Amino acid sequence: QDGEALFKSKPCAACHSVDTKMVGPALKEVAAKNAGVEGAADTLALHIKNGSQGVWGPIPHPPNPVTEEEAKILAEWVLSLK
Ligand code: HEC
Protein backbone atom coordinates (compact mmCIF):
# COMPACT_ATOMS: atom_id res chain seq x y z
CA GLN A 1 0.00 0.00 0.00
CA ASP A 2 2.98 2.34 0.56
CA GLY A 3 4.08 1.76 -3.06
CA GLU A 4 1.34 4.02 -4.48
CA ALA A 5 1.68 6.43 -1.53
CA LEU A 6 5.44 6.70 -2.14
CA PHE A 7 4.96 7.40 -5.87
CA LYS A 8 2.41 10.03 -4.72
CA SER A 9 4.40 12.23 -2.27
CA LYS A 10 7.20 11.71 -4.75
CA PRO A 11 6.06 13.76 -7.80
CA CYS A 12 8.13 11.28 -9.86
CA ALA A 13 4.74 10.77 -11.54
CA ALA A 14 4.32 14.56 -11.89
CA CYS A 15 6.97 14.06 -14.60
CA HIS A 16 6.43 10.29 -15.16
CA SER A 17 3.16 8.57 -16.13
CA VAL A 18 1.52 5.16 -16.64
CA ASP A 19 -0.39 5.36 -19.94
CA THR A 20 0.39 8.81 -21.42
CA LYS A 21 4.09 9.77 -21.11
CA MET A 22 5.09 13.46 -21.16
CA VAL A 23 8.65 14.09 -19.91
CA GLY A 24 9.81 10.56 -19.01
CA PRO A 25 8.68 7.04 -19.98
CA ALA A 26 5.76 5.62 -17.98
CA LEU A 27 6.78 3.24 -15.15
CA LYS A 28 5.62 0.48 -17.55
CA GLU A 29 8.22 1.20 -20.28
CA VAL A 30 10.86 1.76 -17.57
CA ALA A 31 9.69 -1.27 -15.56
CA ALA A 32 9.80 -3.38 -18.75
CA LYS A 33 13.35 -2.20 -19.56
CA ASN A 34 14.61 -3.09 -16.07
CA ALA A 35 12.50 -6.28 -15.92
CA GLY A 36 15.25 -8.58 -17.24
CA VAL A 37 17.66 -6.83 -14.84
CA GLU A 38 17.11 -8.34 -11.37
CA GLY A 39 19.13 -5.33 -10.13
CA ALA A 40 16.55 -2.90 -11.57
CA ALA A 41 16.26 -0.85 -8.35
CA ASP A 42 20.05 -0.49 -8.55
CA THR A 43 19.95 0.89 -12.12
CA LEU A 44 16.99 3.16 -11.28
CA ALA A 45 18.86 4.27 -8.14
CA LEU A 46 22.04 5.56 -9.82
CA HIS A 47 19.79 7.12 -12.48
CA ILE A 48 17.76 9.18 -9.97
CA LYS A 49 20.11 9.36 -6.99
CA ASN A 50 22.84 10.25 -9.55
CA GLY A 51 21.01 11.93 -12.48
CA SER A 52 20.65 9.95 -15.74
CA GLN A 53 20.45 10.62 -19.50
CA GLY A 54 21.37 9.22 -22.95
CA VAL A 55 18.83 6.41 -22.37
CA TRP A 56 15.18 7.41 -22.76
CA GLY A 57 16.21 10.70 -24.46
CA PRO A 58 18.50 13.74 -24.20
CA ILE A 59 16.63 14.90 -21.06
CA PRO A 60 18.69 14.22 -17.90
CA HIS A 61 17.44 13.67 -14.41
CA PRO A 62 17.43 16.01 -11.40
CA PRO A 63 19.21 15.23 -8.12
CA ASN A 64 16.68 12.95 -6.37
CA PRO A 65 18.38 11.53 -3.26
CA VAL A 66 16.23 8.89 -1.53
CA THR A 67 16.85 6.53 1.40
CA GLU A 68 17.68 2.90 0.52
CA GLU A 69 14.50 2.03 2.45
CA GLU A 70 12.25 4.28 0.34
CA ALA A 71 14.26 3.61 -2.84
CA LYS A 72 13.83 -0.14 -2.22
CA ILE A 73 10.06 0.09 -1.66
CA LEU A 74 9.60 2.59 -4.52
CA ALA A 75 11.73 0.25 -6.66
CA GLU A 76 9.49 -2.71 -5.77
CA TRP A 77 6.22 -0.94 -6.59
CA VAL A 78 7.77 0.47 -9.79
CA LEU A 79 9.10 -2.91 -10.99
CA SER A 80 5.96 -4.68 -9.75
CA LEU A 81 3.53 -2.00 -11.02
CA LYS A 82 0.45 -4.28 -11.04
C1 HEC B 1 10.81 15.52 -14.91
C2 HEC B 1 11.66 16.66 -14.34
C3 HEC B 1 11.09 14.24 -14.15
C4 HEC B 1 10.90 14.03 -12.82
C5 HEC B 1 10.40 15.03 -11.81
C6 HEC B 1 11.26 12.74 -12.55
N1 HEC B 1 11.71 12.12 -13.68
FE1 HEC B 1 12.43 10.30 -13.83
N2 HEC B 1 12.82 10.62 -15.75
C7 HEC B 1 12.57 11.75 -16.48
C8 HEC B 1 13.01 11.61 -17.77
C9 HEC B 1 12.93 12.65 -18.88
C10 HEC B 1 13.56 10.36 -17.86
C11 HEC B 1 14.21 9.75 -19.09
C12 HEC B 1 15.57 10.44 -19.27
C13 HEC B 1 16.31 9.83 -20.45
O1 HEC B 1 16.62 10.51 -21.40
O2 HEC B 1 16.60 8.65 -20.44
C14 HEC B 1 13.42 9.77 -16.63
C15 HEC B 1 13.86 8.51 -16.31
C16 HEC B 1 13.76 7.90 -15.08
C17 HEC B 1 14.21 6.63 -14.79
C18 HEC B 1 14.88 5.66 -15.74
C19 HEC B 1 16.16 6.29 -16.29
C20 HEC B 1 16.92 5.25 -17.11
O3 HEC B 1 16.53 4.10 -17.17
O4 HEC B 1 17.95 5.54 -17.67
C21 HEC B 1 13.94 6.40 -13.47
C22 HEC B 1 14.25 5.14 -12.67
C23 HEC B 1 13.33 7.55 -12.99
N3 HEC B 1 13.21 8.48 -13.97
C24 HEC B 1 12.93 7.74 -11.68
C25 HEC B 1 12.34 8.87 -11.17
C26 HEC B 1 11.97 9.04 -9.85
C27 HEC B 1 12.10 8.03 -8.72
C28 HEC B 1 11.48 10.32 -9.75
C29 HEC B 1 10.94 11.00 -8.49
C30 HEC B 1 12.06 11.11 -7.45
C31 HEC B 1 11.57 10.88 -11.00
N4 HEC B 1 12.08 9.99 -11.90
C32 HEC B 1 11.20 12.16 -11.31
C33 HEC B 1 11.99 12.88 -15.96
C34 HEC B 1 11.60 13.07 -14.66
PDB file of N, CA and C and ligand atoms in Angstrom:
ATOM      1  N   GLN A   1       0.859  -1.220   0.000  1.00  0.00           N
ATOM      2  CA  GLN A   1       0.000   0.000   0.000  1.00  0.00           C
ATOM      3  C   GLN A   1       0.882   1.252   0.000  1.00  0.00           C
ATOM      4  N   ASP A   2       2.071   1.155   0.532  1.00  0.00           N
ATOM      5  CA  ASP A   2       2.977   2.340   0.562  1.00  0.00           C
ATOM      6  C   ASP A   2       3.571   2.574  -0.830  1.00  0.00           C
ATOM      7  N   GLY A   3       3.519   1.589  -1.690  1.00  0.00           N
ATOM      8  CA  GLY A   3       4.083   1.759  -3.061  1.00  0.00           C
ATOM      9  C   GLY A   3       3.385   2.927  -3.762  1.00  0.00           C
ATOM     10  N   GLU A   4       2.079   2.908  -3.811  1.00  0.00           N
ATOM     11  CA  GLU A   4       1.340   4.017  -4.478  1.00  0.00           C
ATOM     12  C   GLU A   4       1.525   5.305  -3.674  1.00  0.00           C
ATOM     13  N   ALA A   5       1.501   5.209  -2.372  1.00  0.00           N
ATOM     14  CA  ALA A   5       1.676   6.426  -1.528  1.00  0.00           C
ATOM     15  C   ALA A   5       3.064   7.021  -1.775  1.00  0.00           C
ATOM     16  N   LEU A   6       4.063   6.188  -1.900  1.00  0.00           N
ATOM     17  CA  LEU A   6       5.437   6.700  -2.142  1.00  0.00           C
ATOM     18  C   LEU A   6       5.488   7.396  -3.504  1.00  0.00           C
ATOM     19  N   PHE A   7       4.950   6.775  -4.520  1.00  0.00           N
ATOM     20  CA  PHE A   7       4.955   7.397  -5.868  1.00  0.00           C
ATOM     21  C   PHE A   7       4.099   8.670  -5.836  1.00  0.00           C
ATOM     22  N   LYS A   8       3.269   8.810  -4.831  1.00  0.00           N
ATOM     23  CA  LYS A   8       2.409  10.026  -4.720  1.00  0.00           C
ATOM     24  C   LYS A   8       3.235  11.187  -4.149  1.00  0.00           C
ATOM     25  N   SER A   9       3.581  11.130  -2.882  1.00  0.00           N
ATOM     26  CA  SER A   9       4.398  12.230  -2.271  1.00  0.00           C
ATOM     27  C   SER A   9       5.616  12.485  -3.135  1.00  0.00           C
ATOM     28  N   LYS A  10       6.050  11.498  -3.853  1.00  0.00           N
ATOM     29  CA  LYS A  10       7.198  11.713  -4.749  1.00  0.00           C
ATOM     30  C   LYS A  10       6.622  12.052  -6.128  1.00  0.00           C
ATOM     31  N   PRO A  11       6.592  13.322  -6.485  1.00  0.00           N
ATOM     32  CA  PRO A  11       6.060  13.756  -7.800  1.00  0.00           C
ATOM     33  C   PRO A  11       6.813  13.119  -8.980  1.00  0.00           C
ATOM     34  N   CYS A  12       7.456  11.995  -8.751  1.00  0.00           N
ATOM     35  CA  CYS A  12       8.135  11.282  -9.859  1.00  0.00           C
ATOM     36  C   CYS A  12       7.089  11.103 -10.960  1.00  0.00           C
ATOM     37  N   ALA A  13       5.852  10.920 -10.558  1.00  0.00           N
ATOM     38  CA  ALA A  13       4.743  10.767 -11.538  1.00  0.00           C
ATOM     39  C   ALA A  13       4.437  12.138 -12.137  1.00  0.00           C
ATOM     40  N   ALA A  14       4.577  13.185 -11.358  1.00  0.00           N
ATOM     41  CA  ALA A  14       4.319  14.555 -11.893  1.00  0.00           C
ATOM     42  C   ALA A  14       5.068  14.692 -13.216  1.00  0.00           C
ATOM     43  N   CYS A  15       6.184  14.023 -13.325  1.00  0.00           N
ATOM     44  CA  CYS A  15       6.965  14.055 -14.597  1.00  0.00           C
ATOM     45  C   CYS A  15       6.778  12.703 -15.305  1.00  0.00           C
ATOM     46  N   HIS A  16       6.615  11.644 -14.547  1.00  0.00           N
ATOM     47  CA  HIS A  16       6.428  10.294 -15.162  1.00  0.00           C
ATOM     48  C   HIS A  16       4.939  10.039 -15.402  1.00  0.00           C
ATOM     49  N   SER A  17       4.595   8.872 -15.870  1.00  0.00           N
ATOM     50  CA  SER A  17       3.158   8.572 -16.129  1.00  0.00           C
ATOM     51  C   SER A  17       2.956   7.056 -16.183  1.00  0.00           C
ATOM     52  N   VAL A  18       1.785   6.621 -16.558  1.00  0.00           N
ATOM     53  CA  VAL A  18       1.522   5.156 -16.636  1.00  0.00           C
ATOM     54  C   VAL A  18       1.006   4.810 -18.036  1.00  0.00           C
ATOM     55  N   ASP A  19       0.153   5.635 -18.584  1.00  0.00           N
ATOM     56  CA  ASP A  19      -0.389   5.361 -19.944  1.00  0.00           C
ATOM     57  C   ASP A  19      -0.534   6.677 -20.716  1.00  0.00           C
ATOM     58  N   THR A  20       0.474   7.511 -20.687  1.00  0.00           N
ATOM     59  CA  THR A  20       0.391   8.809 -21.419  1.00  0.00           C
ATOM     60  C   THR A  20       1.800   9.287 -21.782  1.00  0.00           C
ATOM     61  N   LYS A  21       2.692   9.313 -20.827  1.00  0.00           N
ATOM     62  CA  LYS A  21       4.088   9.766 -21.107  1.00  0.00           C
ATOM     63  C   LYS A  21       4.091  11.262 -21.442  1.00  0.00           C
ATOM     64  N   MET A  22       5.015  11.999 -20.883  1.00  0.00           N
ATOM     65  CA  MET A  22       5.087  13.463 -21.164  1.00  0.00           C
ATOM     66  C   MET A  22       6.551  13.910 -21.127  1.00  0.00           C
ATOM     67  N   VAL A  23       7.210  13.700 -20.019  1.00  0.00           N
ATOM     68  CA  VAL A  23       8.647  14.095 -19.907  1.00  0.00           C
ATOM     69  C   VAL A  23       9.507  12.829 -19.822  1.00  0.00           C
ATOM     70  N   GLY A  24       9.041  11.832 -19.121  1.00  0.00           N
ATOM     71  CA  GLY A  24       9.810  10.556 -19.015  1.00  0.00           C
ATOM     72  C   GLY A  24       8.897   9.403 -19.440  1.00  0.00           C
ATOM     73  N   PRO A  25       9.459   8.226 -19.580  1.00  0.00           N
ATOM     74  CA  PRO A  25       8.685   7.042 -19.985  1.00  0.00           C
ATOM     75  C   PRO A  25       7.854   6.520 -18.811  1.00  0.00           C
ATOM     76  N   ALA A  26       6.634   6.129 -19.072  1.00  0.00           N
ATOM     77  CA  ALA A  26       5.756   5.621 -17.981  1.00  0.00           C
ATOM     78  C   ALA A  26       6.461   4.492 -17.225  1.00  0.00           C
ATOM     79  N   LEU A  27       6.140   4.324 -15.966  1.00  0.00           N
ATOM     80  CA  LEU A  27       6.778   3.244 -15.152  1.00  0.00           C
ATOM     81  C   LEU A  27       6.694   1.906 -15.895  1.00  0.00           C
ATOM     82  N   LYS A  28       5.756   1.765 -16.795  1.00  0.00           N
ATOM     83  CA  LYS A  28       5.625   0.483 -17.549  1.00  0.00           C
ATOM     84  C   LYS A  28       6.809   0.319 -18.507  1.00  0.00           C
ATOM     85  N   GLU A  29       7.076   1.307 -19.321  1.00  0.00           N
ATOM     86  CA  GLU A  29       8.219   1.205 -20.277  1.00  0.00           C
ATOM     87  C   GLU A  29       9.522   1.098 -19.487  1.00  0.00           C
ATOM     88  N   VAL A  30       9.624   1.835 -18.417  1.00  0.00           N
ATOM     89  CA  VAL A  30      10.859   1.763 -17.571  1.00  0.00           C
ATOM     90  C   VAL A  30      10.873   0.450 -16.791  1.00  0.00           C
ATOM     91  N   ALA A  31       9.740   0.014 -16.325  1.00  0.00           N
ATOM     92  CA  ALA A  31       9.691  -1.267 -15.564  1.00  0.00           C
ATOM     93  C   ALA A  31       9.956  -2.430 -16.524  1.00  0.00           C
ATOM     94  N   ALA A  32       9.572  -2.286 -17.765  1.00  0.00           N
ATOM     95  CA  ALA A  32       9.803  -3.380 -18.750  1.00  0.00           C
ATOM     96  C   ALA A  32      11.280  -3.398 -19.148  1.00  0.00           C
ATOM     97  N   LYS A  33      11.907  -2.252 -19.184  1.00  0.00           N
ATOM     98  CA  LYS A  33      13.348  -2.199 -19.561  1.00  0.00           C
ATOM     99  C   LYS A  33      14.188  -2.806 -18.437  1.00  0.00           C
ATOM    100  N   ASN A  34      13.830  -2.539 -17.210  1.00  0.00           N
ATOM    101  CA  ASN A  34      14.611  -3.092 -16.070  1.00  0.00           C
ATOM    102  C   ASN A  34      13.947  -4.372 -15.554  1.00  0.00           C
ATOM    103  N   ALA A  35      13.166  -5.025 -16.373  1.00  0.00           N
ATOM    104  CA  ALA A  35      12.499  -6.281 -15.922  1.00  0.00           C
ATOM    105  C   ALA A  35      13.488  -7.441 -16.019  1.00  0.00           C
ATOM    106  N   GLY A  36      14.249  -7.486 -17.078  1.00  0.00           N
ATOM    107  CA  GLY A  36      15.245  -8.584 -17.240  1.00  0.00           C
ATOM    108  C   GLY A  36      16.468  -8.304 -16.359  1.00  0.00           C
ATOM    109  N   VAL A  37      16.506  -7.164 -15.719  1.00  0.00           N
ATOM    110  CA  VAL A  37      17.662  -6.831 -14.843  1.00  0.00           C
ATOM    111  C   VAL A  37      17.238  -6.977 -13.381  1.00  0.00           C
ATOM    112  N   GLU A  38      17.495  -8.116 -12.795  1.00  0.00           N
ATOM    113  CA  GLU A  38      17.106  -8.341 -11.369  1.00  0.00           C
ATOM    114  C   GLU A  38      17.587  -7.171 -10.503  1.00  0.00           C
ATOM    115  N   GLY A  39      18.621  -6.491 -10.923  1.00  0.00           N
ATOM    116  CA  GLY A  39      19.130  -5.334 -10.131  1.00  0.00           C
ATOM    117  C   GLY A  39      18.496  -4.047 -10.662  1.00  0.00           C
ATOM    118  N   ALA A  40      17.245  -4.109 -11.034  1.00  0.00           N
ATOM    119  CA  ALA A  40      16.553  -2.902 -11.569  1.00  0.00           C
ATOM    120  C   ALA A  40      16.668  -1.747 -10.572  1.00  0.00           C
ATOM    121  N   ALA A  41      16.187  -1.936  -9.369  1.00  0.00           N
ATOM    122  CA  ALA A  41      16.255  -0.849  -8.345  1.00  0.00           C
ATOM    123  C   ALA A  41      17.657  -0.239  -8.318  1.00  0.00           C
ATOM    124  N   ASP A  42      18.663  -1.033  -8.550  1.00  0.00           N
ATOM    125  CA  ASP A  42      20.049  -0.492  -8.553  1.00  0.00           C
ATOM    126  C   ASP A  42      20.195   0.466  -9.735  1.00  0.00           C
ATOM    127  N   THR A  43      19.845   0.019 -10.912  1.00  0.00           N
ATOM    128  CA  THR A  43      19.952   0.894 -12.116  1.00  0.00           C
ATOM    129  C   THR A  43      19.089   2.145 -11.925  1.00  0.00           C
ATOM    130  N   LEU A  44      17.874   1.978 -11.476  1.00  0.00           N
ATOM    131  CA  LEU A  44      16.988   3.160 -11.276  1.00  0.00           C
ATOM    132  C   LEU A  44      17.566   4.048 -10.174  1.00  0.00           C
ATOM    133  N   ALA A  45      18.271   3.467  -9.244  1.00  0.00           N
ATOM    134  CA  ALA A  45      18.855   4.271  -8.135  1.00  0.00           C
ATOM    135  C   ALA A  45      19.938   5.207  -8.678  1.00  0.00           C
ATOM    136  N   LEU A  46      20.964   4.672  -9.289  1.00  0.00           N
ATOM    137  CA  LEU A  46      22.044   5.557  -9.817  1.00  0.00           C
ATOM    138  C   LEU A  46      21.470   6.516 -10.860  1.00  0.00           C
ATOM    139  N   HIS A  47      20.356   6.194 -11.458  1.00  0.00           N
ATOM    140  CA  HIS A  47      19.795   7.125 -12.475  1.00  0.00           C
ATOM    141  C   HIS A  47      19.119   8.309 -11.777  1.00  0.00           C
ATOM    142  N   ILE A  48      18.436   8.065 -10.697  1.00  0.00           N
ATOM    143  CA  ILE A  48      17.759   9.179  -9.973  1.00  0.00           C
ATOM    144  C   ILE A  48      18.726   9.743  -8.942  1.00  0.00           C
ATOM    145  N   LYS A  49      19.154   8.912  -8.044  1.00  0.00           N
ATOM    146  CA  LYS A  49      20.108   9.361  -6.989  1.00  0.00           C
ATOM    147  C   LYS A  49      21.363   9.972  -7.634  1.00  0.00           C
ATOM    148  N   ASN A  50      21.619   9.684  -8.889  1.00  0.00           N
ATOM    149  CA  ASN A  50      22.837  10.249  -9.548  1.00  0.00           C
ATOM    150  C   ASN A  50      22.498  10.762 -10.951  1.00  0.00           C
ATOM    151  N   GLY A  51      21.375  11.413 -11.121  1.00  0.00           N
ATOM    152  CA  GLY A  51      21.015  11.930 -12.478  1.00  0.00           C
ATOM    153  C   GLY A  51      21.052  10.782 -13.499  1.00  0.00           C
ATOM    154  N   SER A  52      20.634  11.030 -14.713  1.00  0.00           N
ATOM    155  CA  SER A  52      20.646   9.946 -15.740  1.00  0.00           C
ATOM    156  C   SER A  52      20.201  10.512 -17.089  1.00  0.00           C
ATOM    157  N   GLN A  53      20.840  10.102 -18.155  1.00  0.00           N
ATOM    158  CA  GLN A  53      20.452  10.618 -19.498  1.00  0.00           C
ATOM    159  C   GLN A  53      21.070   9.733 -20.591  1.00  0.00           C
ATOM    160  N   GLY A  54      20.795  10.031 -21.834  1.00  0.00           N
ATOM    161  CA  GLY A  54      21.368   9.216 -22.949  1.00  0.00           C
ATOM    162  C   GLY A  54      20.685   7.846 -22.999  1.00  0.00           C
ATOM    163  N   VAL A  55      19.549   7.714 -22.372  1.00  0.00           N
ATOM    164  CA  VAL A  55      18.833   6.407 -22.373  1.00  0.00           C
ATOM    165  C   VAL A  55      17.450   6.589 -22.997  1.00  0.00           C
ATOM    166  N   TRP A  56      16.559   7.186 -22.262  1.00  0.00           N
ATOM    167  CA  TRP A  56      15.175   7.413 -22.761  1.00  0.00           C
ATOM    168  C   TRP A  56      15.111   8.730 -23.546  1.00  0.00           C
ATOM    169  N   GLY A  57      16.220   9.408 -23.701  1.00  0.00           N
ATOM    170  CA  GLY A  57      16.208  10.696 -24.457  1.00  0.00           C
ATOM    171  C   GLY A  57      17.362  11.588 -23.978  1.00  0.00           C
ATOM    172  N   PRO A  58      17.447  12.765 -24.548  1.00  0.00           N
ATOM    173  CA  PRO A  58      18.496  13.741 -24.200  1.00  0.00           C
ATOM    174  C   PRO A  58      18.144  14.491 -22.907  1.00  0.00           C
ATOM    175  N   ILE A  59      17.018  14.192 -22.311  1.00  0.00           N
ATOM    176  CA  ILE A  59      16.626  14.900 -21.056  1.00  0.00           C
ATOM    177  C   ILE A  59      17.190  14.154 -19.836  1.00  0.00           C
ATOM    178  N   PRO A  60      18.066  14.806 -19.104  1.00  0.00           N
ATOM    179  CA  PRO A  60      18.690  14.220 -17.903  1.00  0.00           C
ATOM    180  C   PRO A  60      17.764  14.282 -16.715  1.00  0.00           C
ATOM    181  N   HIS A  61      18.247  13.770 -15.639  1.00  0.00           N
ATOM    182  CA  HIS A  61      17.441  13.674 -14.415  1.00  0.00           C
ATOM    183  C   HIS A  61      17.966  14.589 -13.311  1.00  0.00           C
ATOM    184  N   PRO A  62      17.056  15.125 -12.523  1.00  0.00           N
ATOM    185  CA  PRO A  62      17.427  16.009 -11.396  1.00  0.00           C
ATOM    186  C   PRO A  62      18.091  15.193 -10.280  1.00  0.00           C
ATOM    187  N   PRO A  63      18.580  15.880  -9.278  1.00  0.00           N
ATOM    188  CA  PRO A  63      19.207  15.232  -8.118  1.00  0.00           C
ATOM    189  C   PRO A  63      18.093  14.751  -7.184  1.00  0.00           C
ATOM    190  N   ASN A  64      17.787  13.486  -7.219  1.00  0.00           N
ATOM    191  CA  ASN A  64      16.679  12.955  -6.369  1.00  0.00           C
ATOM    192  C   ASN A  64      17.246  11.919  -5.388  1.00  0.00           C
ATOM    193  N   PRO A  65      17.791  12.401  -4.293  1.00  0.00           N
ATOM    194  CA  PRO A  65      18.384  11.535  -3.261  1.00  0.00           C
ATOM    195  C   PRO A  65      17.291  10.893  -2.402  1.00  0.00           C
ATOM    196  N   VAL A  66      17.258   9.589  -2.353  1.00  0.00           N
ATOM    197  CA  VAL A  66      16.225   8.894  -1.532  1.00  0.00           C
ATOM    198  C   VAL A  66      16.918   7.901  -0.600  1.00  0.00           C
ATOM    199  N   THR A  67      16.243   7.502   0.438  1.00  0.00           N
ATOM    200  CA  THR A  67      16.847   6.534   1.397  1.00  0.00           C
ATOM    201  C   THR A  67      16.735   5.120   0.825  1.00  0.00           C
ATOM    202  N   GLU A  68      17.725   4.297   1.056  1.00  0.00           N
ATOM    203  CA  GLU A  68      17.685   2.901   0.525  1.00  0.00           C
ATOM    204  C   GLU A  68      16.364   2.235   0.915  1.00  0.00           C
ATOM    205  N   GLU A  69      15.793   2.631   2.021  1.00  0.00           N
ATOM    206  CA  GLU A  69      14.500   2.026   2.451  1.00  0.00           C
ATOM    207  C   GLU A  69      13.393   2.485   1.501  1.00  0.00           C
ATOM    208  N   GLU A  70      13.302   3.766   1.261  1.00  0.00           N
ATOM    209  CA  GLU A  70      12.250   4.282   0.340  1.00  0.00           C
ATOM    210  C   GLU A  70      12.600   3.896  -1.098  1.00  0.00           C
ATOM    211  N   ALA A  71      13.856   3.973  -1.454  1.00  0.00           N
ATOM    212  CA  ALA A  71      14.263   3.607  -2.840  1.00  0.00           C
ATOM    213  C   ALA A  71      13.970   2.125  -3.078  1.00  0.00           C
ATOM    214  N   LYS A  72      14.104   1.317  -2.061  1.00  0.00           N
ATOM    215  CA  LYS A  72      13.830  -0.139  -2.220  1.00  0.00           C
ATOM    216  C   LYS A  72      12.326  -0.354  -2.385  1.00  0.00           C
ATOM    217  N   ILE A  73      11.533   0.263  -1.551  1.00  0.00           N
ATOM    218  CA  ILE A  73      10.058   0.094  -1.664  1.00  0.00           C
ATOM    219  C   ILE A  73       9.576   0.725  -2.969  1.00  0.00           C
ATOM    220  N   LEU A  74      10.021   1.914  -3.255  1.00  0.00           N
ATOM    221  CA  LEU A  74       9.602   2.585  -4.516  1.00  0.00           C
ATOM    222  C   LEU A  74      10.110   1.776  -5.706  1.00  0.00           C
ATOM    223  N   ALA A  75      11.191   1.067  -5.536  1.00  0.00           N
ATOM    224  CA  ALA A  75      11.730   0.254  -6.663  1.00  0.00           C
ATOM    225  C   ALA A  75      10.928  -1.043  -6.778  1.00  0.00           C
ATOM    226  N   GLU A  76      10.302  -1.464  -5.712  1.00  0.00           N
ATOM    227  CA  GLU A  76       9.494  -2.712  -5.772  1.00  0.00           C
ATOM    228  C   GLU A  76       8.137  -2.393  -6.394  1.00  0.00           C
ATOM    229  N   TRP A  77       7.532  -1.304  -6.002  1.00  0.00           N
ATOM    230  CA  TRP A  77       6.216  -0.939  -6.588  1.00  0.00           C
ATOM    231  C   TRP A  77       6.419  -0.559  -8.057  1.00  0.00           C
ATOM    232  N   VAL A  78       7.514   0.077  -8.374  1.00  0.00           N
ATOM    233  CA  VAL A  78       7.766   0.468  -9.788  1.00  0.00           C
ATOM    234  C   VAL A  78       8.017  -0.776 -10.645  1.00  0.00           C
ATOM    235  N   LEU A  79       8.831  -1.692 -10.185  1.00  0.00           N
ATOM    236  CA  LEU A  79       9.104  -2.908 -10.993  1.00  0.00           C
ATOM    237  C   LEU A  79       7.896  -3.841 -10.941  1.00  0.00           C
ATOM    238  N   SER A  80       7.156  -3.802  -9.869  1.00  0.00           N
ATOM    239  CA  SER A  80       5.961  -4.684  -9.753  1.00  0.00           C
ATOM    240  C   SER A  80       4.768  -4.023 -10.449  1.00  0.00           C
ATOM    241  N   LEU A  81       4.667  -2.720 -10.367  1.00  0.00           N
ATOM    242  CA  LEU A  81       3.534  -1.998 -11.017  1.00  0.00           C
ATOM    243  C   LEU A  81       2.197  -2.644 -10.627  1.00  0.00           C
ATOM    244  N   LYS A  82       1.747  -3.620 -11.371  1.00  0.00           N
ATOM    245  CA  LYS A  82       0.455  -4.284 -11.035  1.00  0.00           C
ATOM    246  C   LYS A  82       0.335  -5.592 -11.819  1.00  0.00           C
TER     247      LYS A  82
HETATM  248  C1  HEC B   1      10.806  15.522 -14.911  1.00  0.00           C
HETATM  249  C2  HEC B   1      11.659  16.660 -14.341  1.00  0.00           C
HETATM  250  C3  HEC B   1      11.087  14.239 -14.152  1.00  0.00           C
HETATM  251  C4  HEC B   1      10.905  14.033 -12.817  1.00  0.00           C
HETATM  252  C5  HEC B   1      10.403  15.031 -11.809  1.00  0.00           C
HETATM  253  C6  HEC B   1      11.261  12.743 -12.554  1.00  0.00           C
HETATM  254  N1  HEC B   1      11.707  12.124 -13.680  1.00  0.00           N
HETATM  255 FE1  HEC B   1      12.432  10.295 -13.832  1.00  0.00          FE
HETATM  256  N2  HEC B   1      12.820  10.619 -15.750  1.00  0.00           N
HETATM  257  C7  HEC B   1      12.571  11.752 -16.476  1.00  0.00           C
HETATM  258  C8  HEC B   1      13.014  11.612 -17.773  1.00  0.00           C
HETATM  259  C9  HEC B   1      12.933  12.655 -18.880  1.00  0.00           C
HETATM  260  C10 HEC B   1      13.562  10.364 -17.865  1.00  0.00           C
HETATM  261  C11 HEC B   1      14.208   9.752 -19.087  1.00  0.00           C
HETATM  262  C12 HEC B   1      15.565  10.438 -19.273  1.00  0.00           C
HETATM  263  C13 HEC B   1      16.312   9.827 -20.449  1.00  0.00           C
HETATM  264  O1  HEC B   1      16.619  10.508 -21.405  1.00  0.00           O
HETATM  265  O2  HEC B   1      16.604   8.652 -20.440  1.00  0.00           O
HETATM  266  C14 HEC B   1      13.424   9.772 -16.629  1.00  0.00           C
HETATM  267  C15 HEC B   1      13.855   8.505 -16.313  1.00  0.00           C
HETATM  268  C16 HEC B   1      13.760   7.897 -15.081  1.00  0.00           C
HETATM  269  C17 HEC B   1      14.208   6.628 -14.788  1.00  0.00           C
HETATM  270  C18 HEC B   1      14.878   5.663 -15.745  1.00  0.00           C
HETATM  271  C19 HEC B   1      16.162   6.292 -16.290  1.00  0.00           C
HETATM  272  C20 HEC B   1      16.923   5.250 -17.107  1.00  0.00           C
HETATM  273  O3  HEC B   1      16.526   4.104 -17.167  1.00  0.00           O
HETATM  274  O4  HEC B   1      17.951   5.538 -17.667  1.00  0.00           O
HETATM  275  C21 HEC B   1      13.936   6.404 -13.466  1.00  0.00           C
HETATM  276  C22 HEC B   1      14.250   5.145 -12.673  1.00  0.00           C
HETATM  277  C23 HEC B   1      13.333   7.547 -12.987  1.00  0.00           C
HETATM  278  N3  HEC B   1      13.212   8.482 -13.975  1.00  0.00           N
HETATM  279  C24 HEC B   1      12.927   7.735 -11.682  1.00  0.00           C
HETATM  280  C25 HEC B   1      12.342   8.870 -11.170  1.00  0.00           C
HETATM  281  C26 HEC B   1      11.968   9.045  -9.849  1.00  0.00           C
HETATM  282  C27 HEC B   1      12.095   8.026  -8.723  1.00  0.00           C
HETATM  283  C28 HEC B   1      11.477  10.321  -9.748  1.00  0.00           C
HETATM  284  C29 HEC B   1      10.944  11.000  -8.494  1.00  0.00           C
HETATM  285  C30 HEC B   1      12.062  11.108  -7.454  1.00  0.00           C
HETATM  286  C31 HEC B   1      11.566  10.880 -11.004  1.00  0.00           C
HETATM  287  N4  HEC B   1      12.082   9.992 -11.902  1.00  0.00           N
HETATM  288  C32 HEC B   1      11.198  12.162 -11.314  1.00  0.00           C
HETATM  289  C33 HEC B   1      11.991  12.885 -15.963  1.00  0.00           C
HETATM  290  C34 HEC B   1      11.598  13.068 -14.662  1.00  0.00           C
END
